[PDB]
Amino acid sequence: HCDLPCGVYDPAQARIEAESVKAIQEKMAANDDLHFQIRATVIKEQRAELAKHHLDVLWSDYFKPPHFESYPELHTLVNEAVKALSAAKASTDPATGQKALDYIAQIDKIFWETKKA
């Protein structure tokens, strides 16, 4: 995932950051303090950005034509996933964070299926 290439990839990197995004949104719903809201927004922005980066890496570096051919909806899936994370940045609703996680879960399954080949 470092572009050497190293041969090491794991959608878990994207998932873990995305889990932080939703976790932060849930915390924002339990505390309306101004400074907490500012910090939560700043940090959620950072973790969502990292999640997008990890997904972009899988898309650009790991997945190759045969994968996009075998899984015709993969390009759309990853693009919807990163767009879902962008939506999560602009929202405090945990549902947006979950939407991203729903897509990431699918990418993870596809990833491991391709690993068996």
Residues within the interface to a copy of itself (CB under 8 A):
1-8, 10, 12-13, 16, 19-20, 23-24, 27, 34-43, 45-47, 49, 52-53, 56, 59-61, 63, 68, 75-76, 79, 82-83, 86, 89-90, 92
**Minimum distance of a copy of itself from residue 19's CB (angstroms):** 5
DSSP code, position 60: I
Cα-to-chain-centroid distance, residue 39: 21
Give the nearer residue to Ni ion in terms of CB position, either 36 or 73: 36
Q: Is 6 annotated as a binding residue?
A: yes
Amino acid at 51: A
**The pair of three-digit structure tokens given for residue 13, joined into one six-digit string:** 């990197």
CA distances from 95 to 26, 35, 48 (A): 9, 23, 14
φ/ψ of 9, rounded to 5, equals: -140, 150
Between residue 6 and residue 25, which ones bind Ni ion under the rule CB under 5 A? 6, 20
**Minimum distance of a copy of itself from residue 117's CB (angstroms):** 19
Other CB atoms within 10 A of residue 82 CB: 21
User: 108, 36 in Cβ contact below 8 A?
Assistant: no
Identify what 68 binds: Ni ion, a copy of itself, none; CB under 5 to 8 Å per kind.
a copy of itself
Annotated binding-site members for Ni(2+): 1-2, 6
Contact residues for Ni ion, defined by CB under 5 A? 1-2, 6, 20
